[PDB]
Write an enzyme that holds these catalytic residues in place. Structure first.
Site, short mmCIF file in Angstrom:
data_model
loop_
_atom_site.label_atom_id
_atom_site.label_comp_id
_atom_site.label_asym_id
_atom_site.label_seq_id
_atom_site.Cartn_x
_atom_site.Cartn_y
_atom_site.Cartn_z
N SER A 168 12.62 -19.38 -7.72
CA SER A 168 12.33 -18.66 -8.95
C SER A 168 12.97 -17.29 -8.92
N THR A 177 13.67 8.79 0.03
CA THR A 177 12.45 8.57 -0.73
C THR A 177 11.97 9.94 -1.14
N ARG A 201 -7.08 -6.09 12.62
CA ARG A 201 -6.85 -6.89 11.40
C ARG A 201 -7.36 -8.33 11.50
N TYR A 261 10.28 -3.34 -0.31
CA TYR A 261 11.14 -2.49 -1.16
C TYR A 261 11.37 -3.16 -2.56
N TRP A 282 -0.48 -13.99 5.76
CA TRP A 282 0.63 -14.26 4.83
C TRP A 282 1.98 -14.37 5.57
N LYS A 333 13.44 11.22 -4.23
CA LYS A 333 12.81 10.70 -5.41
C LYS A 333 11.55 11.45 -5.79
N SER A 339 9.98 6.73 -13.02
CA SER A 339 11.00 7.63 -13.58
C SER A 339 10.95 7.69 -15.08
N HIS A 385 10.39 -3.13 13.17
CA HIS A 385 9.20 -2.24 13.22
C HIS A 385 7.87 -3.03 12.96
N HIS A 386 8.02 -4.28 12.52
CA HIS A 386 6.93 -5.22 12.45
C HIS A 386 6.65 -5.90 13.77
N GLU A 395 11.35 -7.29 1.30
CA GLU A 395 10.27 -7.62 0.37
C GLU A 395 9.44 -6.41 -0.11
N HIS A 437 -5.18 -14.06 -0.71
CA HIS A 437 -5.17 -12.72 -1.31
C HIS A 437 -3.75 -12.10 -1.33
C1 HEA Z 1 0.16 -5.85 -3.98
C2 HEA Z 1 -0.45 -6.38 -2.92
C3 HEA Z 1 -1.92 -6.12 -2.68
C4 HEA Z 1 -2.90 -5.54 -3.51
C5 HEA Z 1 -2.65 -5.04 -4.90
C6 HEA Z 1 -4.09 -5.51 -2.75
C7 HEA Z 1 -5.36 -5.04 -3.24
C8 HEA Z 1 -6.59 -5.03 -2.49
N1 HEA Z 1 -6.73 -5.50 -1.25
FE1 HEA Z 1 -5.25 -6.31 -0.01
N2 HEA Z 1 -3.75 -7.12 1.25
C9 HEA Z 1 -2.48 -7.32 0.91
C10 HEA Z 1 -1.92 -7.04 -0.37
C11 HEA Z 1 -2.60 -6.42 -1.49
N3 HEA Z 1 -3.90 -6.12 -1.56
C12 HEA Z 1 -1.76 -7.86 1.96
C13 HEA Z 1 -0.31 -8.23 1.91
C14 HEA Z 1 -2.67 -8.01 3.03
C15 HEA Z 1 -2.44 -8.57 4.43
C16 HEA Z 1 -2.74 -10.07 4.48
C17 HEA Z 1 -2.65 -10.61 5.93
O1 HEA Z 1 -3.18 -9.96 6.89
O2 HEA Z 1 -2.04 -11.69 6.22
C18 HEA Z 1 -3.89 -7.52 2.53
C19 HEA Z 1 -5.08 -7.38 3.34
C20 HEA Z 1 -6.34 -6.78 2.89
C21 HEA Z 1 -7.47 -6.60 3.73
C22 HEA Z 1 -7.55 -6.89 5.22
C23 HEA Z 1 -7.95 -8.28 5.62
C24 HEA Z 1 -8.18 -8.36 7.12
O3 HEA Z 1 -7.38 -7.84 7.93
O4 HEA Z 1 -9.19 -8.96 7.55
C25 HEA Z 1 -8.45 -6.07 2.88
C26 HEA Z 1 -9.84 -5.69 3.20
O5 HEA Z 1 -10.36 -4.67 2.79
C27 HEA Z 1 -7.88 -5.97 1.63
C28 HEA Z 1 -8.54 -5.55 0.43
C29 HEA Z 1 -7.99 -5.30 -0.89
C30 HEA Z 1 -8.69 -4.75 -1.97
C31 HEA Z 1 -10.14 -4.39 -2.03
C32 HEA Z 1 -7.81 -4.58 -3.00
C33 HEA Z 1 -8.21 -4.05 -4.34
O6 HEA Z 1 -7.69 -2.71 -4.36
C34 HEA Z 1 -7.79 -4.73 -5.64
C35 HEA Z 1 -8.32 -4.18 -6.99
C36 HEA Z 1 -7.53 -5.00 -7.99
C37 HEA Z 1 -6.27 -4.67 -8.40
C38 HEA Z 1 -5.63 -3.43 -7.84
C39 HEA Z 1 -5.28 -5.46 -9.22
C40 HEA Z 1 -5.21 -6.07 -10.57
C41 HEA Z 1 -3.85 -5.92 -11.24
C42 HEA Z 1 -3.84 -6.82 -12.23
C43 HEA Z 1 -5.07 -7.67 -12.39
C44 HEA Z 1 -2.73 -7.05 -13.22
C45 HEA Z 1 -3.34 -6.57 -14.51
C46 HEA Z 1 -2.60 -7.22 -15.61
C47 HEA Z 1 -1.74 -6.54 -16.35
C48 HEA Z 1 -1.45 -5.08 -16.16
C49 HEA Z 1 -1.08 -7.35 -17.40
N4 HEA Z 1 -6.64 -6.44 1.62
C1 HEA Z 2 5.31 -1.28 -1.47
C2 HEA Z 2 5.08 -1.66 -0.23
C3 HEA Z 2 5.48 -0.88 1.00
C4 HEA Z 2 6.33 0.22 1.09
C5 HEA Z 2 7.08 0.94 -0.02
C6 HEA Z 2 6.31 0.59 2.44
C7 HEA Z 2 7.07 1.71 2.96
C8 HEA Z 2 7.14 2.11 4.34
N1 HEA Z 2 6.55 1.48 5.35
FE1 HEA Z 2 5.33 -0.21 5.25
N2 HEA Z 2 4.10 -1.92 5.13
C9 HEA Z 2 3.76 -2.56 3.99
C10 HEA Z 2 4.15 -2.21 2.64
C11 HEA Z 2 5.04 -1.13 2.30
N3 HEA Z 2 5.52 -0.22 3.15
C12 HEA Z 2 3.02 -3.70 4.30
C13 HEA Z 2 2.49 -4.69 3.31
C14 HEA Z 2 2.90 -3.73 5.69
C15 HEA Z 2 2.22 -4.74 6.55
C16 HEA Z 2 3.01 -6.04 6.73
C17 HEA Z 2 2.02 -6.97 7.41
O1 HEA Z 2 1.86 -6.91 8.67
O2 HEA Z 2 1.35 -7.75 6.68
C18 HEA Z 2 3.57 -2.60 6.14
C19 HEA Z 2 3.78 -2.28 7.51
C20 HEA Z 2 4.59 -1.20 8.03
C21 HEA Z 2 4.83 -1.02 9.40
C22 HEA Z 2 4.29 -1.86 10.56
C23 HEA Z 2 3.00 -1.35 11.16
C24 HEA Z 2 2.48 -2.46 12.04
O3 HEA Z 2 2.33 -3.63 11.60
O4 HEA Z 2 2.22 -2.17 13.23
C25 HEA Z 2 5.64 0.14 9.49
C26 HEA Z 2 6.16 0.77 10.73
O5 HEA Z 2 7.22 1.38 10.65
C27 HEA Z 2 5.82 0.55 8.17
C28 HEA Z 2 6.52 1.73 7.75
C29 HEA Z 2 6.88 2.15 6.43
C30 HEA Z 2 7.69 3.23 6.16
C31 HEA Z 2 8.26 4.24 7.11
C32 HEA Z 2 7.87 3.21 4.80
C33 HEA Z 2 8.69 4.17 4.00
O6 HEA Z 2 9.43 3.39 3.01
C34 HEA Z 2 7.88 5.21 3.25
C35 HEA Z 2 8.78 6.38 2.85
C36 HEA Z 2 8.02 7.35 1.99
C37 HEA Z 2 7.61 8.59 2.40
C38 HEA Z 2 7.85 9.13 3.79
C39 HEA Z 2 6.85 9.53 1.45
C40 HEA Z 2 7.71 10.31 0.42
C41 HEA Z 2 8.56 11.37 1.08
C42 HEA Z 2 8.42 12.73 1.11
C43 HEA Z 2 7.30 13.43 0.39
C44 HEA Z 2 9.48 13.53 1.87
C45 HEA Z 2 9.09 14.09 3.21
C46 HEA Z 2 8.64 13.11 4.29
C47 HEA Z 2 8.83 13.32 5.62
C48 HEA Z 2 9.54 14.56 6.11
C49 HEA Z 2 8.36 12.31 6.62
N4 HEA Z 2 5.18 -0.24 7.31
CU CU Z 3 8.60 -3.08 7.01
#
Ligand code: HEA
Ligand code: HEA
Ligand code: CU
Ligand code: PEK
Ligand code: PGV
Ligand code: DMU
Ligand code: CUA
Ligand code: MG
Ligand code: NA
Ligand code: ZN
Lengths: 49, 144, 84, 227, 105, 79, 98, 58, 514, 73, 43, 46, 259
Positions: I156, I316, I438, I244, I126, I319, I255, I290-291, I242, I61
């Site tokens: 790629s 952020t 998880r 970001y 993953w 933005k 934008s 922080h991971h 990744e 997934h």
């Molecule tokens: C972008 C990344 C992404 C997206 C979009 C999603 C979407 C969803 N995810 Fe996923 N998820 C992850 C990335 C993402 N996930 C990651 C990284 C983990 C952690 C894995 C790990 O633990 O190792 C995770 C884990 C995770 C868990 C936890 C598993 C566990 O801990 O046991 C669950 C369970 O509810 C979940 C559910 C879902 C669901 C219901 C959606 C639904 O919202 C999806 C509905 C469908 C869509 C939003 C997308 C379709 C978009 C297109 C089809 C493109 C269309 C084509 C054009 C526009 C040309 N996800």
């Molecule tokens: C697009 C994907 C995406 C983005 C943009 C971010 C953005 C951020 N993420 Fe995260 N994150 C994930 C995808 C992403 N994340 C995923 C996939 C994981 C799980 C990895 C895994 O274990 O599989 C994860 C996990 C993760 C962790 C680890 C938790 C754990 O495993 O125990 C943490 C902890 O710091 C973190 C923090 C943040 C923070 C601080 C930001 C910041 O960049 C967000 C900043 C934005 C805002 C704050 C909002 C806008 C701001 C305002 C409106 C202004 C005012 C705000 C304040 C005064 C606070 N993220």
């Molecule tokens: Cu991070």
């Protein structure tokens, strides 16, 4: 000249709403889904030991 | 009047509140009477009739502000239809419960639950706020 | 630093050739001397079957699965000791 | 343990977990406030026919929207960091207990005086005694003295696991070849449950943790009886 | 920037250029409606007269529509403006969008 | 004699979460001491504190592996 | 110490490389390497926009340092004006390859 | 060696409509066909291998 | 003709199209996987089998959604289609290498599918942490296939990043400075920089895993003096950048979309937006641990990673506020793309904020490896990245295809998705705060309610995904041909018509220096 | 036949913004006050009150008699 | 945006078909698998 | 050279909307079906 | 007809054959590691070589023979190569990180020291010092080569470039021999692991770079380069400096400081 929405809007809204409420209420209460609500205010504790 | 694909690079017409005087007229070609009307427009506008004034407007512009800014009944279609597909989703859930899911664990039976609930209370699960806090140990009942 | 030589009026081909044959190659020749002198096989150490060494979590995909890729009989013991 | 429909943290069992609840209330307030303000301003921007589409000057309002969030972050980081250092404070434990992660169960070692160790496995659903909790009960609980500072040492003998007990604010990863330290102190007797918190294979979901907190005297006699 | 009176005068002068061309007419209106204001009657007066010099009745009416539009929910503004423009509208024979039925959807 | 031990006290040398070296070090110290004492004609009992500390801290399997390795001649630490 | 035997661009450059190089030598820019310099851009002094067809996209940076570029097709004929700042541009069609 | 670049420039600038990877003549075609055959063949064979590996051999 | 055009392409629009096709197909795979997840968790007990099959599903997934849907659509698809058009370039700098970046993806995907078909699959997460992912706990070919899949996706993207950076630095009109390039272009450039720097580190890490699994090295094996924690540092050094990478081009499209449907000629505070993307790009390289707040790290390290992670909020925030300022005083067009964008601004903010909660290592002790993390990242990915992709897709479909969507249907689609994703993820906050871990196939009985409601929400999303396919079919079925587009004067990409010709800007734009 | 008054015709958007941003600020303080009463203070007083006269031995003893412990009958 | 009228209009009926066929292509194969899950789980 | 314009800048035909429906169905459908059939494949091994 | 200076490339099969060859090599490795067979691998390596050969051939066709490499194109190629080298630096960075991580906190399994108990490192003053003087000298000869080419001197270009290649080849032979002579192996814990994988990828880069130089050498023999247009040579030279610098970091860290 009246468009799709002027002619069908009210029907699509009415029958859309009715269908969605009906089928969600049915799925929520009639098919044996366990929601596991809080025991608080609902369960009489029973001796287990 | 009639717009063509291969005119994309030419100045075009738009109806927009914030661009009130577009780059071209709505109508560029003029019939004999339309030509005469553009001539009359060069004299006092007081001598123009209401119909003539409307016609001059309609040569220059496609829709009035009122026409362009009109609201519609689209929301009904949109909301209605979304409810319909959400409703349809319930059918998928119904199908899934019936044909895919088996029975749930025995720990959800009513008697199991009642016993577990006592035990949770005997162990004072969340005694400060969450669970046991809500039980009157003195009156042996849920806090009213 | 500034090294200990001079030129800098214009670094061209002539200068870089000067450095190639005047400095670089002579250094390679000196280090070659030094190496082909301190060489000679040093006496291989007693074998001790340490558990942090001669790791085998999966057989190698060549030979009998138990020899490293540039196994040298003289100096690389197997997990069970030096070879015959 | 968690209870049906729970919205927030399990009730605090240790002074540290109480500290995290107050710090989370403080942060959550800030999260609601900011996201509700954002939603509000979106709706404000969207609900007027008045327009101003010419070039807007930026270098003035950018101050406000940099300084304000900066102030807010500091207001989070301060109590955040105070708690973090508290959790690190020297405490002098009365007792050291090791736990080793395994596929798929935990073993415990109490080796301060005698050589006490045993395995702790999930009770299978088919063998639950009435009123016991599915996926949470173990055959042999980690009996510990209440109201005392205990040092927990955590490791693994195979893959990663992680030892967690939400009510006590604990989670320490269990890494082979490494001995991680945490400290535990329960304010109350009782049973406190947690679950393996690193993916560790086929039965990751089924290797729970159960702490039994009782008075020192009962803990001593249990230990003895367990040799 | 500048005072309100300087702004308005700058716009009055813009539209009052005897030999203003069609392009400048449009550029003027299209720029002006970008600002956070409903143009003062004197500015509109000048724009309308420019319409007359350019033999463009339809743009005069469109200008009156844009005034209305720029007031948004402030329903008092447009009729104030029309009231102030009335001698000009009578002199130039400009009918309002309402007189022309162009306010109906 | 100077004892009455509950558990290994805080040691300012190993103040962090990773306690691996604390076990190891006390394991080496005990066995160093034991060798010193068994050789020069003295008593193992002076080694006791290190024995208690390592016993408290070290996982059984580590101690057990280390002891097997010392017997085998494969223990990589210096004793 | 020194000798020759390495060809020069003059002797060996070919195709489009050669064309750019020869053009540059006569001070010309048929392949649009350089940024053209603005005239005053009035009706009388319009910006002269070369083209091998009858229309070309102009992008106008109205004031120095604007981040926003205004894009429009410039057509053969009467000078057109930038829709944001009114500066004038005139297409001067044809040739490049003789 | 003599400088024969001018001959190569004439050959590759010949207005015969060939893409650059075929413009050298008949050998380009052979070498292309070998390459593509090995790749397409090898890919089918990797699909066969996945098929095989997808099932237990007890 | 067909082969020359679609297998041997050197055209930036054709290659964009291939990427969007590929991306859409990946999305279907990713969606199915996520329904399997939620089917397993939709009622207490076991549906599929134990945690292995379950985590094979979870792992695939994430890999599919991240490497096969999001990155290909944003960078491969929108990047290739729009970046050359937005700078008036005749193509990308390395048009042929561009094609290889595309064709690496199908084999990459084939490797991922292979690993799930051989043995018992890679049920590793993953993140692919050893020792679970090593050759004793995951014997046989599955993990090696996963590693090789990532190597191909990695190559790629590195080649793609080199291509985008070179194109954007080198191929603008001579008079256009970097401060005159659109924000989308900036967003892609900054993304490419992060790719260039971070993917090689992941490559190093997974290679080391490959050698521990197959060549008896012991980088991560305590037996040989290695450390499982070293893997985590190498992976996360990549993995934070990744995320970001996954959001930046989204920010870029947001934008444009917001500017466009507000009827503005430009976004508010352009330089502030450039600054913000750069700062976010830079800060995203110094926060990776922080991971790792629970692995046993020194208190001061934990203090530093908490503080450096939090600072990201500031750029952020600029933005978010600038997007609101762009709306301000707009002539708002309530198009389907605008709805996606407005949803984006709100839901991304929520996810960002819950990220800020997680930044606090103190509280992360309790939240880490629970559903609170899952809820945070799905707000920013499933509602963030995906909303920006949908917004972009509907906004530019007419440019790519020459045809228009039915707007009503698109609004319906938005509405269903919006309810779906919210119902799916909002309750997972409760599950996390109350301690649901998880990567569980099953949970204690207390957690039943929120898991039920969450799985129901995932079915609503499924419905939206199905409707989307129908909507695209309907557009191509009806053939409503685009006529006029507004605001071309500030949206260069539209100015050559819909679709633009195969070759655009054969004669470059004319831009005066002045 | 009365004329109409010259209304305000400039800065209408800005004026609306100012008014409502000020309103948003006031609501924020009102919610902060509410939340620090119905959530934050409520929580501290729950814990304070619970522990004020809490008797851990008495609690244990109740648990023991109910039969919950492996180590205490 | 402005557009021409559909070159090949898709009527309500035709849309109902496309929509049915679309939903069917997603639901049938998954449904088949999930329905036969038990048959798989022990065989 | 190549075909240009709506419905020609794409690797699939949109000449017939029913043939198109079939193709889109196979395409998106095969994507969506794959994981279910992979799950089935794993279940039926052991 | 275009009136910009960039290169519209002819539609090409090499991207596809490149991608497929990646699939064949990775599959092949899998097959080799797990199914005891080298055949997929050999095919992949073959098509990989054929791809590289034709692709770069075509680049030469497009530049030397067709004239597409205007200054704007050349400038793009420069950024490309710089960017590529940066990505290679980061790759190496991971291996150094692994090295410093293991050796700065040597674990109990190693004896808690570095080098681990039972490891006898090579003397850094012997062959490794020789290797250092070899690559450094090659850095000098290649600079002489560059200058000769800019000064239009055919013969001395060829001489210096030959010398540079011979040095590359020398380093490789010395390293092969060290590998054979080394009393420790890749399987000797984290010491052997970091040593062989880091110096191994390095050696691979020396081979690539030598090859690139040899291509330059033959293109020069064929008069392809002018005194002012010779990017392929610059690129090879930058790459070659990169290789040299990675060596110095390996030498300082692993051979000297890690002994
Ligand atoms: C972008 C990344 C992404 C997206 C979009 C999603 C979407 C969803 N995810 Fe996923 N998820 C992850 C990335 C993402 N996930 C990651 C990284 C983990 C952690 C894995 C790990 O633990 O190792 C995770 C884990 C995770 C868990 C936890 C598993 C566990 O801990 O046991 C669950 C369970 O509810 C979940 C559910 C879902 C669901 C219901 C959606 C639904 O919202 C999806 C509905 C469908 C869509 C939003 C997308 C379709 C978009 C297109 C089809 C493109 C269309 C084509 C054009 C526009 C040309 N996800
Ligand atoms: C697009 C994907 C995406 C983005 C943009 C971010 C953005 C951020 N993420 Fe995260 N994150 C994930 C995808 C992403 N994340 C995923 C996939 C994981 C799980 C990895 C895994 O274990 O599989 C994860 C996990 C993760 C962790 C680890 C938790 C754990 O495993 O125990 C943490 C902890 O710091 C973190 C923090 C943040 C923070 C601080 C930001 C910041 O960049 C967000 C900043 C934005 C805002 C704050 C909002 C806008 C701001 C305002 C409106 C202004 C005012 C705000 C304040 C005064 C606070 N993220
Ligand atoms: Cu991070
Ligand atoms: C002479 C100096 C030049 C070095 C090149 C040598 C030729 C062999 C081919 C491999 C080249 C690959 C480079 C790095 C790969 C890993 C280790 C190679 C370093 C090496 O050569 O180490 C040898 C071990 O070889 C082994 O297992 C090697 C077994 C060979 C299997 C190769 C493994 C393939 C791994 C694929 C990884 C590719 C992924 C990289 C991705 C790049 C980014 C996408 C050392 O021999 P030993 O007997 O242990 O000790 C000597 C005892 N007397
Ligand atoms: C046993 C050996 C096999 C090992 C596998 C790898 C094999 C060897 C790869 C060696 C690389 C050979 C590259 C040859 C490129 C020749 C084409 C060339 O150099 O093309 C030049 C352009 O540069 C360009 O594209 C620049 C092209 C740069 C290519 C960069 C090379 C790096 C490849 C690395 C791949 C491995 C990955 C590393 C694994 C971790 C052409 O321009 P000029 O020179 O100005 O000529 C024109 C003048 O004549 C006009 O007057
Ligand atoms: C996670 C996303 C999936 C969402 C849920 C799927 C929605 C339901 C779609 C229906 O799919 C079908 O349903 C059947 C029954 O309703 C099937 O008939 C099966 O069962 C029958 C009726 O009992 C028999 O007639 C047949 O042999 C047959 O095998 C089955 O094959 C299947 O194609
Ligand atoms: Cu043990 Cu998860
Ligand atoms: Mg974890
Ligand atoms: Na389940
Ligand atoms: Zn301008």
């Amino acid at each position: 000249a009246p468009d799709f929405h002027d002619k069908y809007g009210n029907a699509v809204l009415a029958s859309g709403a009715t269908f969605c409420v009906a089928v969600w209420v049915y799925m929520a209460t009639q098919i044996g889904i366990e929601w596991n609500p809080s025991p608080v205010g609902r369960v009489t504790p029973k001796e287990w030991r | 009047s009639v717009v063509k694909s291969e005119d994309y690079a030419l100045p075009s017409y738009v109806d927009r509140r914030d661009y009130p005087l577009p780059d071209v007229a709505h109508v560029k070609n003029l019939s004999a009477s339309q030509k005469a009307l553009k001539e009359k427009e060069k004299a006092s506008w007081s001598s123009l009739s209401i119909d003539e004034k409307v016609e001059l407007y309609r040569l220059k512009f496609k829709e009035s502000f009122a026409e362009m800014n009109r609201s519609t009944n689209e929301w009904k279609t949109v909301v209605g239809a979304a409810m319909f597909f959400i409703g349809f989703t319930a059918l998928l859930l119904i199908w899934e419960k019936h044909y895919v899911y088996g029975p749930i664990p025995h720990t959800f039976e009513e008697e199991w639950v009642a016993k577990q609930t006592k035990r949770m209370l005997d162990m004072k699960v969340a005694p400060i706020q969450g669970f046991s806090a809500k039980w009157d140990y003195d009156k042996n009942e849920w806090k009213k | 630093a500034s090294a200990a030589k001079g030129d800098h009026g214009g670094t061209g081909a002539r200068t870089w050739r000067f450095l190639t044959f005047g400095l670089a190659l002579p250094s390679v020749a000196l280090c070659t001397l030094n190496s082909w002198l301190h060489s000679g096989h040093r006496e291989r150490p007693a074998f001790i079957p340490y558990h942090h060494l001669r790791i085998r979590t999966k057989p190698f995909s060549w030979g009998d699965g138990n020899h490293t890729f540039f196994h040298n009989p003289r100096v690389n013991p197997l997990p069970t000791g030096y070879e015959k | 343990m968690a209870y049906p429909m729970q919205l927030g943290f399990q009730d605090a069992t240790s002074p540290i977990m109480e500290e995290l609840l107050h710090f989370h209330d403080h942060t959550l307030m800030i999260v609601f406030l900011i996201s509700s303000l954002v939603l509000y301003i979106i709706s404000l921007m969207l609900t007027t026919k008045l327009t101003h589409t010419s070039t807007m000057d930026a270098q003035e309002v950018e101050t406000i929207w940099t300084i304000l969030p900066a102030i807010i972050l500091i207001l989070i980081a301060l109590p955040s960091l105070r708690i973090l250092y508290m959790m690190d404070e020297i405490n002098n434990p009365s007792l050291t207990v090791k736990t080793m992660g395994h596929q798929w169960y935990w073993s415990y070692e109490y080796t301060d005086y005698e050589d006490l160790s045993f395995d702790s496995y999930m009770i299978p659903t088919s063998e639950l005694k009435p009123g016991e909790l599915r996926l949470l009960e173990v055959d042999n609980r980690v009996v510990l003295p209440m109201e005392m500072t205990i040092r927990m040492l955590v490791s693994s003998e195979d893959v990663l696991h992680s030892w967690a007990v939400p009510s006590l604010g604990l989670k320490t990863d269990a890494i082979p070849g490494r001995l991680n330290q945490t400290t535990l102190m329960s304010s109350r007797p009782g049973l406190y449950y947690g679950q393996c918190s690193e993916i560790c294979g086929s039965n990751h979901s089924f290797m729970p943790i159960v702490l039994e907190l009782v008075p020192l005297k009962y803990f001593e006699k249990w230990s003895a009886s367990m040799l | 920037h500048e005072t309100d009176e300087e702004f308005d005068a700058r716009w009055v002068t813009y539209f009052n250029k005897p030999d203003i061309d069609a392009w400048e007419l449009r550029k003027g209106m299209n720029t002006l409606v970008g600002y956070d204001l409903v143009p003062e009657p004197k500015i509109i007066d000048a724009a309308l007269r420019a319409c007359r010099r350019l033999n463009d009745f339809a743009s005069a009416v469109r200008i009156l529509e844009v005034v209305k539009d720029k007031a948004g929910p402030h329903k008092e503004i447009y009729p104030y403006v029309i009231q102030e423009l009335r001698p000009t509208l009578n002199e130039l024979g400009i009918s309002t969008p309402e007189e022309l039925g162009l306010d109906k959807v | 004699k100077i004892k009455n031990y509950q558990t290994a006290p805080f040691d300012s040398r190993f103040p962090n979460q990773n306690q691996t070296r604390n076990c190891w070090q006390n394991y080496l110290d005990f066995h160093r001491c034991e060798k010193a004492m068994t050789a020069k004609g003295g008593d193992v009992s002076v080694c006791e504190w290190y024995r208690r500390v390592y016993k408290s801290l070290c996982p059984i399997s580590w101690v057990s592996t280390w002891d097997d390795r010392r017997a085998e001649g494969t223990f990589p630490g210096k004793i | 110490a020194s000798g020759g035997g390495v060809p020069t661009d003059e002797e060996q450059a070919t195709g489009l490389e050669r064309e750019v190089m020869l053009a540059a030598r006569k001070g010309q820019d048929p392949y649009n390497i350089l940024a053209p310099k603005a005239t005053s851009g009035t009706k009388e002094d319009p910006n002269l926009v070369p083209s091998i067809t009858n229309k070309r996209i102009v992008g106008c940076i109205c004031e120095e340092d604007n981040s926003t570029v205004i894009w429009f097709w410039l057509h053969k004929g009467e000078a057109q004006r930038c829709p944001s700042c009114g500066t004038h541009y005139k297409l001067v069609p044809h040739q490049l390859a003789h | 060696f003599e400088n024969r670049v001018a001959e190569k420039q004439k050959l590759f600038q010949e207005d015969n409509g060939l893409p650059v990877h075929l413009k050298g003549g008949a050998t380009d075609n052979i070498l292309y066909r070998v390459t593509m055959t090995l790749c397409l063949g090898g890919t089918l064979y990797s699909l066969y291998c996945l098929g095989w590996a997808s099932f237990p051999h007890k | 003709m067909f082969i020359n055009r679609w297998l041997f392409s050197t055209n930036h629009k054709d290659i964009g199209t291939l990427y969007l096709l590929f991306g859409a197909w990946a999305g279907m795979v990713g969606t199915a996987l996520s329904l399997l997840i939620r089917a397993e968790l939709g009622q207490p007990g076991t549906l599929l089998g134990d945690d292995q099959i379950y985590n094979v599903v979870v792992t695939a997934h994430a890999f599919v959604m991240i490497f096969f849907m999001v990155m290909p659509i944003m960078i491969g698809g929108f990047g290739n289609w729009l970046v050359p058009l937005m700078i008036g370039a005749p193509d990308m700098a390395f048009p042929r290498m561009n094609n290889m970046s595309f064709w690496l993806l199908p084999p990459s995907f084939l490797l991922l599918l292979a690993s799930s078909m051989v043995e018992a699959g890679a049920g590793t997460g993953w993140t692919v942490y050893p020792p679970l992912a090593g050759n004793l706990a995951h014997a046989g070919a599955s993990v090696d296939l996963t590693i090789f899949s990532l190597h191909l996706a990695g190559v790629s993207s590195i080649l793609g990043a080199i291509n985008f950076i070179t194109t954007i630095i080198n191929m603008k009109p001579p008079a256009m400075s970097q401060y005159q390039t659109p924000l989308f272009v900036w967003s892609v450039m900054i993304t490419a920089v992060l790719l260039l720097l971070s993917l090689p580190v992941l490559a190093a890490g997974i290679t080391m895993l490959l050698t521990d699994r197959n060549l008896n090295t012991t980088f991560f094996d305590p037996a040989g003096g290695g450390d499982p924690i070293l893997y985590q540092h190498l992976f996360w050094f990549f993995g934070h950048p990744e995320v970001y990478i996954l959001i930046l081009p989204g920010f870029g499209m947001i934008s444009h979309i917001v500017t466009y449907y507000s009827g503005k000629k430009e976004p508010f505070g352009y330089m502030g937006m450039v600054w913000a993307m750069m700062s976010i790009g830079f800060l995203g390289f110094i926060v990776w641990a922080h991971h790792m707040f629970t692995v046993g790290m020194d208190v001061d390290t934990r203090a530093y990673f908490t503080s450096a992670t939090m600072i990201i909020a500031i750029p952020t925030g600029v933005k978010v506020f600038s997007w609101l300022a762009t709306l301000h005083g707009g002539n708002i067009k309530w198009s389907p793309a605008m709805m996606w964008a407005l949803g984006f601004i709100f839901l991304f903010t929520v996810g960002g904020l819950t990220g800020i909660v997680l930044a606090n290592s103190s509280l992360d002790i309790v939240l880490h490896d629970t559903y609170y993390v899952v809820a945070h990242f799905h707000y920013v990915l499933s509602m963030g990245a995906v909303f920006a992709i949908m917004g972009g897709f509907v906004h530019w479909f007419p440019l790519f295809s020459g045809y228009t969507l039915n707007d009503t249907w698109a609004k319906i689609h938005f509405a269903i998705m919006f309810v779906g994703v919210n119902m799916t993820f909002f309750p997972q906050h409760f599950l996390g705060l109350s301690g649901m871990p998880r990567r569980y196939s099953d949970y204690p009985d207390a957690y039943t309610m929120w898991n039920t409601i969450s799985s129901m929400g995932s079915f609503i999303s499924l419905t939206a995904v199905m409707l989307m396919v129908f909507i695209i079919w309907e557009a191509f079925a009806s053939k409503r041909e685009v006529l006029t587009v507004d605001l071309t004067t500030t949206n260069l990409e539209w100015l050559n018509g819909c679709p633009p010709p195969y070759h655009t800007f054969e004669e470059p734009t004319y831009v005066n220096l002045k | 036949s009365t004329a109409l008054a010259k209304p305000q015709m400039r800065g209408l958007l800005a004026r609306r913004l100012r008014f409502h941003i000020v309103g948003a600020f006031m609501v924020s303080l009102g919610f902060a006050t509410f939340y620090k009463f119905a959530v934050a203070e409520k929580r501290k007083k729950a814990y304070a009150d619970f522990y004020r006269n809490y008797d851990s031995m008495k609690d244990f003893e109740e648990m023991r008699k109910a039969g919950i412990f492996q180590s205490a009958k | 945006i402005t557009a021409k009228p559909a070159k090949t209009p898709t009527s309500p009926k035709e849309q109902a078909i496309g929509l049915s066929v679309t939903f069917l292509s997603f639901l049938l194969p998954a449904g088949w698998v999930l329905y036969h899950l038990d048959n798989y789980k022990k065989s | 050279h190549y075909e240009e314009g709506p419905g020609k800048n794409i690797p699939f035909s949109v000449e017939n909307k029913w043939r198109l429906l079939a193709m889109m169905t196979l395409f998106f459908g095969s994507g969506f079906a794959a994981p279910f059939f992979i799950v089935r494949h794993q279940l039926l091994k052991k | 007809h275009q009136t910009h200076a960039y290169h519209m490339v002819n539609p090409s099969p090499w991207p596809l054959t490149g991608a497929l060859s990646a699939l064949l090599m990775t599959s092949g490795l899998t097959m080799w590691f797990h199914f005891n067979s080298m055949t997929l691998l050999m095919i992949g390596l073959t098509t990989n070589m054929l791809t590289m050969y034709q692709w770069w051939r075509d680049v030469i066709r497009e530049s030397t023979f067709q004239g597409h490499h205007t200054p704007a194109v050349q400038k793009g190629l420069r950024y490309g190569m710089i960017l590529f080298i940066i990505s290679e630096v980061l790759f190496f960075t991971g291996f150094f990180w692994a090295f410093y991580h293991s050796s700065l906190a040597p674990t109990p399994e190693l004896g808690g020291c570095w080098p681990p108990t039972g490891i006898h490192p090579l003397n850094p003053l012997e062959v490794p010092l020789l290797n250092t003087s070899v690559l450094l000298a090659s850095g000098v000869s290649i600079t002489w080569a560059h200058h000769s080419l800019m000064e239009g001197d055919r013969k001395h270009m060829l001489q210096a470039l030959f010398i540079t290649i011979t040095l590359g080849v020398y380093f490789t032979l010395l390293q092969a021999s060290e590998y054979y002579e080394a009393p420790f192996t890749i399987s000797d814990g984290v010491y052997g692991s970091t040593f062989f994988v880091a110096t191994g990828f390095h050696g691979l880069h020396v081979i690539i770079g030598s090859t690139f130089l040899i291509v330059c050498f033959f293109r020069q023999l064929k008069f392809h380069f002018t005194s002012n247009h010779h990017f392929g040579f610059e690129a090879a030279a930058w790459y070659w400096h990169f290789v040299d610098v990675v060596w110095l970091f390996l030498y300082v860290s692993i051979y000297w400081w890690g002994s």
